[PDB]
Design an enzyme around this catalytic site. Sequence first.
Site, short mmCIF file in Angstrom:
data_model
loop_
_atom_site.label_atom_id
_atom_site.label_comp_id
_atom_site.label_asym_id
_atom_site.label_seq_id
_atom_site.Cartn_x
_atom_site.Cartn_y
_atom_site.Cartn_z
N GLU A 141 55.34 38.65 38.47
CA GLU A 141 55.23 37.46 37.66
C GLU A 141 55.97 36.27 38.25
O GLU A 141 57.14 36.44 38.91
CB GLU A 141 56.01 37.78 36.30
CG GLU A 141 56.59 36.86 35.55
CD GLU A 141 57.31 36.81 34.12
OE1 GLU A 141 57.17 38.19 33.83
OE2 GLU A 141 57.97 36.07 33.75
N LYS A 183 55.13 40.06 24.89
CA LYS A 183 56.43 40.40 25.41
C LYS A 183 57.34 40.59 24.63
O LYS A 183 57.28 40.10 23.55
CB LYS A 183 56.72 39.28 26.48
CG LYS A 183 58.02 39.39 27.01
CD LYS A 183 58.35 38.01 27.73
CE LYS A 183 57.30 38.09 29.07
NZ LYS A 183 57.55 39.25 29.77
#
Lengths: 135, 203
Positions: free
Chosen positions: B39, B128
Amino acid sequence: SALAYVMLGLLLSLLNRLSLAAEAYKKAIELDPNDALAWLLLGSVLEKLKRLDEAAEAYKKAIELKPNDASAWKELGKVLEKLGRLDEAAKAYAEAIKLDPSDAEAAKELGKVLEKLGQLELAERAYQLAIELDP
Amino acid sequence: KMEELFKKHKIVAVLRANSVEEAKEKALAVFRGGVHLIEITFTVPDADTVIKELSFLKEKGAIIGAGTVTDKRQCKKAVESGAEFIVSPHLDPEISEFCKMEGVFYMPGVMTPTELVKAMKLGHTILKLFPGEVVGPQFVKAMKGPFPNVKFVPTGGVNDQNVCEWFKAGVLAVGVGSALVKGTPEQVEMLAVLFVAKIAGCT
């Protein structure tokens, strides 16, 4: 006799005559350099013989023929641990658990290779993985 | 479906770095040692350039995704930078429609059940959990009942002490912060395979 010599060298190893078994592992390698077993045994046979620098050499050729034995990596991280390179041996125990995450030996023995290296942080996190993999 | 590509590599390197060169070296030891979901957060200086660099890793097996979106400007940092997916905390339905038009996966960092229902009406059933350190593993089983469709990828408060506490509560993958990244390109490799070992073997 590419296989017959490997077994002969085993028998000689079974009688403490490890130096005398060292030949029979060569004479098997001479008959087939790709015989993955004759390398791993010869490395462990030189490790017992404590031809330490040369011992890691056969343990290198074995990880070439079959590049995924947690045995050959773990038993190379040992040979490299005594040899001196506690950095390449730390890479070896790592490459071993990169193959087998249930290695309570390569985790503890890397916790030692790292707790002697410097990072108590990075040795802790393997010391606390070896607790998961053993009662 | 990123539904597939997550699930497999049950870990994402939530990477925050102060410079651009130190960013390259922290996707280096991370990817070389274990992790394949990278990420690229957006506290990073010009992360829309670092992703366009590390595109030779998408070949070798990496998933160079962008991170921490805040509104509809860091999706002018969108697909032309090379982002294969973009995440954030909870926010913004228009970057679920800004990416509806560009065709790239978004994941909100849900915290409350409002953020979960208001983003399920979007279509995103992959979430998330941010900040994961505050909600706790309780929030997995608590929501797994009434919403038997939502997935969770915790972000924050996930270390090797309590990583399997999140997983057998029932999650998809985990996002890891400083406990994986903070180090030198060797600590960064070691700390990464350290995690994939404690992850692959959650009993």
